[PDB]
Amino acid sequence: PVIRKFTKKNVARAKKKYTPFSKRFKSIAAIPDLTSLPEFYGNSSELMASRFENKLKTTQKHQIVETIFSKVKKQLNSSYYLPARENEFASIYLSAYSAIESDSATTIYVAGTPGVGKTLTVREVVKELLSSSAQREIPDFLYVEINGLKMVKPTDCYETLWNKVSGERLTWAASMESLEFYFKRVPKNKKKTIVVLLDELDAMVTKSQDIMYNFFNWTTYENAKLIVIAVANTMDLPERQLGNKITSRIGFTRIMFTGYTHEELKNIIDLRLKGLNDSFFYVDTKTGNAILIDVRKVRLRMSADAIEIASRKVASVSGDARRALKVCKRAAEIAEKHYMAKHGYGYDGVQTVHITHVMKALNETLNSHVITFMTRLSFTAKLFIYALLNLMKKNGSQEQELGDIVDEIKLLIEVNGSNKFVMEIAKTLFQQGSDNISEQLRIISWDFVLNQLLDAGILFKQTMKNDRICCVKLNISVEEAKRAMNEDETLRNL
Amino acid sequence: MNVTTPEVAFREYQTNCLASYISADPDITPSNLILQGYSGTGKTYTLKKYFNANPNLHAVWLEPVELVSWKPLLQAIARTVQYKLKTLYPNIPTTDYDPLQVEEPFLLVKTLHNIFVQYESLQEKTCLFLILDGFDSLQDLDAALFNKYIKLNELLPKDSKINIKFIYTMLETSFLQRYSTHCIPTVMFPRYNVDEVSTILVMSRCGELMEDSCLRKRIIEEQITDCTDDQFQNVAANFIHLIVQAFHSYTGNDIFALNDLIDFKWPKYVSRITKENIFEPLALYKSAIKLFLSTDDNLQTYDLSIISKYLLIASYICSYLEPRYDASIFSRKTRIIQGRAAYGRRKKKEVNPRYLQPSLFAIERLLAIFQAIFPIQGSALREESLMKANIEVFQNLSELHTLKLIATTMNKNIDYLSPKVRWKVNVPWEIIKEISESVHFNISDYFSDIHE
Amino acid sequence: NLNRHIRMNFETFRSLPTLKNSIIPLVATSKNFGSLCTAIKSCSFLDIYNKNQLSNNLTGRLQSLSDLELAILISAARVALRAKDGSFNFNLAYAEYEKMIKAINSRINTIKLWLKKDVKNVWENLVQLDFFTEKSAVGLRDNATAAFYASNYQFQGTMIPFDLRSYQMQIILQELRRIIPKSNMYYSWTQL
DNA sequence: TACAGATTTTATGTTTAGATCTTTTATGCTTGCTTTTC
DNA sequence: TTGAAAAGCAAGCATAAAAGATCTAAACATAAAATCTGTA
Numbered sequence A: 001p002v003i004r005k006f007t008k009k010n011v012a013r014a015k016k017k018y019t020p021f022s023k024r025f026k027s028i029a030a031i032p033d034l035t036s037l038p039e040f041y042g043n044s045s046e047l048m049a050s051r052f053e054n055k056l057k058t059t060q061k062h063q064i065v066e067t068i069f070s071k072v073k074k075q076l077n078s079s080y081y082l083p084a085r086e087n088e089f090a091s092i093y094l095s096a097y098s099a100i101e102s103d104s105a106t107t108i109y110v111a112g113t114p115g116v117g118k119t120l121t122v123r124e125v126v127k128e129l130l131s132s133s134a135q136r137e138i139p140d141f142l143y144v145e146i147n148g149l150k151m152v153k154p155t156d157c158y159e160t161l162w163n164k165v166s167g168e169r170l171t172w173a174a175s176m177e178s179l180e181f182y183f184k185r186v187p188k189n190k191k192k193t194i195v196v197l198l199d200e201l202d203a204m205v206t207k208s209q210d211i212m213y214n215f216f217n218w219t220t221y222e223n224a225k226l227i228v229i230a231v232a233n234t235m236d237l238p239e240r241q242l243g244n245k246i247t248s249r250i251g252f253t254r255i256m257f258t259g260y261t262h263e264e265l266k267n268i269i270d271l272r273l274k275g276l277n278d279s280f281f282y283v284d285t286k287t288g289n290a291i292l293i294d295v296r297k298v299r300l301r302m303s304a305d306a307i308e309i310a311s312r313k314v315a316s317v318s319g320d321a322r323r324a325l326k327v328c329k330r331a332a333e334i335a336e337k338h339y340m341a342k343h344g345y346g347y348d349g350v351q352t353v354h355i356t357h358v359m360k361a362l363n364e365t366l367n368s369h370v371i372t373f374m375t376r377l378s379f380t381a382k383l384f385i386y387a388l389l390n391l392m393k394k395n396g397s398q399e400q401e402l403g404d405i406v407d408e409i410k411l412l413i414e415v416n417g418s419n420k421f422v423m424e425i426a427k428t429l430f431q432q433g434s435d436n437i438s439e440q441l442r443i444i445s446w447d448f449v450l451n452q453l454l455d456a457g458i459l460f461k462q463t464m465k466n467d468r469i470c471c472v473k474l475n476i477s478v479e480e481a482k483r484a485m486n487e488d489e490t491l492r493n494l
Numbered sequence B: 001m002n003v004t005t006p007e008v009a010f011r012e013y014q015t016n017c018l019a020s021y022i023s024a025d026p027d028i029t030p031s032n033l034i035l036q037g038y039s040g041t042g043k044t045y046t047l048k049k050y051f052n053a054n055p056n057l058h059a060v061w062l063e064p065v066e067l068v069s070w071k072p073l074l075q076a077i078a079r080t081v082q083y084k085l086k087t088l089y090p091n092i093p094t095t096d097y098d099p100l101q102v103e104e105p106f107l108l109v110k111t112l113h114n115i116f117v118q119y120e121s122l123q124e125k126t127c128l129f130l131i132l133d134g135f136d137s138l139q140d141l142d143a144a145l146f147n148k149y150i151k152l153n154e155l156l157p158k159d160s161k162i163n164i165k166f167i168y169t170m171l172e173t174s175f176l177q178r179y180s181t182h183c184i185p186t187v188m189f190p191r192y193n194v195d196e197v198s199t200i201l202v203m204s205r206c207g208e209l210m211e212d213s214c215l216r217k218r219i220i221e222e223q224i225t226d227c228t229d230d231q232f233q234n235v236a237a238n239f240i241h242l243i244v245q246a247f248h249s250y251t252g253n254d255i256f257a258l259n260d261l262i263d264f265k266w267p268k269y270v271s272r273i274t275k276e277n278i279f280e281p282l283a284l285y286k287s288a289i290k291l292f293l294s295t296d297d298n299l300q301t302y303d304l305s306i307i308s309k310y311l312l313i314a315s316y317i318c319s320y321l322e323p324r325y326d327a328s329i330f331s332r333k334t335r336i337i338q339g340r341a342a343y344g345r346r347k348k349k350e351v352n353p354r355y356l357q358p359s360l361f362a363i364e365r366l367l368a369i370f371q372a373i374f375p376i377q378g379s380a381l382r383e384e385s386l387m388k389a390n391i392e393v394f395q396n397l398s399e400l401h402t403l404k405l406i407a408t409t410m411n412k413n414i415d416y417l418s419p420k421v422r423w424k425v426n427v428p429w430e431i432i433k434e435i436s437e438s439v440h441f442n443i444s445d446y447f448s449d450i451h452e
Numbered sequence C: 001n002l003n004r005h006i007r008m009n010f011e012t013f014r015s016l017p018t019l020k021n022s023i024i025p026l027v028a029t030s031k032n033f034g035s036l037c038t039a040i041k042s043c044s045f046l047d048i049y050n051k052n053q054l055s056n057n058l059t060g061r062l063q064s065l066s067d068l069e070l071a072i073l074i075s076a077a078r079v080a081l082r083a084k085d086g087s088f089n090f091n092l093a094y095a096e097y098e099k100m101i102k103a104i105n106s107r108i109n110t111i112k113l114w115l116k117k118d119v120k121n122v123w124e125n126l127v128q129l130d131f132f133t134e135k136s137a138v139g140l141r142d143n144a145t146a147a148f149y150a151s152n153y154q155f156q157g158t159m160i161p162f163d164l165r166s167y168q169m170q171i172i173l174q175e176l177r178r179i180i181p182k183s184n185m186y187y188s189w190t191q192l
Numbered sequence D: 001t002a003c004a005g006a007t008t009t010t011a012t013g014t015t016t017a018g019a020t021c022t023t024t025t026a027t028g029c030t031t032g033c034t035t036t037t038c
Numbered sequence E: 001t002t003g004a005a006a007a008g009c010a011a012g013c014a015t016a017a018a019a020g021a022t023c024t025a026a027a028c029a030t031a032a033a034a035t036c037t038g039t040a
Ligand SMILES: Nc1ncnc2c1ncn2[C@@H]1O[C@H](COP(=O)(O)OP(=O)(O)OP(O)(O)=S)[C@@H](O)[C@H]1O
Pocket: A077, A078, A079, A081, A082, A083, A084, A085, A112, A113, A114, A115, A116, A117, A118, A119, A120, A121, A268, A321, A322
């Protein structure tokens, strides 16, 4: 045969066809009704879940103990009635209902900051629309959800949509022409409205505006019945991508989701804990199992001051809801740990949570752990930091040479040769305590402390093979290093 | 424990540490081990002797210098592991995995796990030693490859009957200090003294030297030599000692350079001997004093045309002289319009500018000076005595440039026709001096004035 | 002695794995129980281990150089001290070397003055042992792509002839003065 | 009148040729002063 | 001698230019699944 110049022995290719849709049913007048086909619109395909489920199952439960705080922790996750988001719900629902009722196409753009709750309210709107359609008030439709961060290649959207509307399996380009023909030329008497939910839109338009332009433009055609809802972080993202005139031609609806306040967040937290708060529980003393209404009758309380202070702190900085929920959950977890530790329980009066637990859980996310890290470092590393600070206090250049640091360390050692500690540390620092080792040039354990400081994210060193003129710089500002040095004793004194 | 320590000449502590670290029990042995030492320090010799002293230990030898990348290294590992495991146990049925399928570090782990699964019918856990002898000699090396081979020992199965352990042999210290935080056990091989080098050199190239045919021919052409073996060994040892004492200050503590000089200077020293001084080392030393002073480790200088010969000199003058003083050196004609020449330099430079990098000039100045210094061309109204720049001058200049004797501002696909291009010289003073002396030109007079 | 070594590790390294690696050969080397007891009583093996661990650093190579290499190194350091940015090359170093040798000979057996072609080998040997580095050269790149990019470009340092490459020093003259013993005959020349 | 054959479509790996930006050193203008010619 | 002129020297300075880091796109190259094309 032939001699290959290189080989690819780990190539895997999926079985997908190439011929687009506008070659199948011949003339346009020969297209049958697509509503009644058993493969179109997912009419009969409801067995994909059973293909891979029942694999992660096992048969054993050794009477898992459920402490009192377990219920509170379980009922406070980010998965388990919208209290604040009502205007956006009304606007989106009205737009979508008007679009569905009159058999038209439309585009809704939602922009916001993380944790506001845009996906939740969009899904709630979709559920309400599905219920209304099942009530036989508007023509039935299909709901397709497409995410942006859950795809390997960015151009995998097209085929997915096609695979959710036809049952075929084509490549991305052929899917693009198939979708174009389907949305343009198929008559409106043989289709069904589709509600796409393009999500994390900013992750698709990163090399070109092709996907966004196509998806937004497919709503312009008269024969199409598409209703696109796209959510994103930045508000004026399409303008920065497509252009003013194209956007003006398209004419979509725009909605902005502002952050939360310290009242709405507290309302959310209080709503998520209604039945549990101020209730009664039967608790077994031997094990610790708790049952909602020998054994004891106890109560669970959560101080409103703790909720208020947590909401006030969280809403001040970001406006999230996930972080507030997680803070409350962590406070409950700390209280549960203390309770089990005190009562000597294990895995398999009025118990409350005070403001102290919430404050302790809140301080863990704001404080930094650099000062504590340096107040426990070795003597040589602290000497290195001290020499660097001294050189910076003279040159004021923020980027020092390494040989200068070595010379400064040597001068500092040789000029204070009258203090007891540095008098008796010199031999262990230069000859490691033995009389058979010649006097070293740099220090004992130079590279070790250098790499220990450089790995932790405290120093920055440029790459040069000459190890005497390499430049290093700090990365934690200067006041923190000054505090860390001042907390010492032998370095403070000299 | 249960291992045997071999006897190496001047590597006692290294041998003790090696016997302390590696053994046949996977429970007590380190997953990684580094041996460090510069060129010609005696590490592969010690390791090979140690493995030859203990035949129970299994080992696979690689040399990541023939392999010049990481993908070939992975494939070589995946192939040699299979080959060694097949040749050792022949009664275990097994399939074959193509080494060329290994293209990524993860695929190497998958293939190694698949290979190690089959040999699960063995009695007790063993250990297989993989010696990457020369890890620092990879041609395209970066500071990330080692971080993968360090952690490769955690993704493999933990309860398999075949355990793999790595052993590296590293040259430099700057590379090794990069990974000093990992705290991997190390054994360092310091360089040799002079006495140790002399003794090692004698012990190595003493026996082999005497069975050479040259000395046999020289003694069959000569008379009898009683006490043949002892006298021959003494002669060899004396020659080795003489060559060491002569060229230690030039070869350093390098075994290879001395081992090459000994072979270089043997065929003549054996010719210089004779019967009347075969038993007199001193007189023999006097009779062969010539080959102990000059090392001689080397293998018109150029064959250029006349105009190229002067063109190189003109380029050198252009590059290593300052333009402001040009007019004072070459103006040699009368004037009709009133004018004055240049006064010239007032003080001499004290740096001898020929010790520094050459400067840049222009083509026009080069042509002008070439015309100025070119020898005169061999009813004078139509003489045209001065040489003019015709086609062949430019052709020879291009020939000079393409031979790397003239450089320019180096960038890909130069365009010779642009004002932003300048030239310079790439020959040392010796070559230009030889060229000048080969055409009867006194170049030194131009440079003696500034500094001899 | 064990407490003293522990305290030294605490004040210098502060890491258990280093001490563990130090202790392993101490207990794996002894052959008899009495030997183990006396080794743990005296801890004389840890000194040998520490001495070896420092046997290839910057000051461990300087004590394994011949006379000519030491003289060339001293001359190069002297030349590099006077320069503005510390750069030098072969010709200046050899000129300083020959001046120093002539001064030594005239002051006073005569010391042989090796020729240029014999000093070339010593220069290459010194640049191999990582005593000089090129003018402005990076070492090993951080990742593979950077090395691949750099391997396709011809640096200007490999086109200039041998005599004009600009090197830089890694040991300053003061360190030579500190390290070299006072009995050496080149000691007086280690300061300007 | 298929089907083993040749051809096309979608999908990544391997090496060469050229472009833009950042850091550091060399080149030329200016201003004031003074030796050299003549 | 004669200083007026040209030539020479030096300090302070701005600004072009060299050397290399970081990246992109064309040319060169291999491969599995689907379509196309002569004839049983
Ligand atoms: N009005 C609300 N009522 C109850 N829970 C809410 C409300 N708003 C937000 N949440 C919480 O917010 C959690 C996160 O979901 P979302 O806020 O919809 O996420 P998101 O807005 O898509 O965030 P991204 O993806 O980072 S922009 C939900 O699981 C809810 O617990």
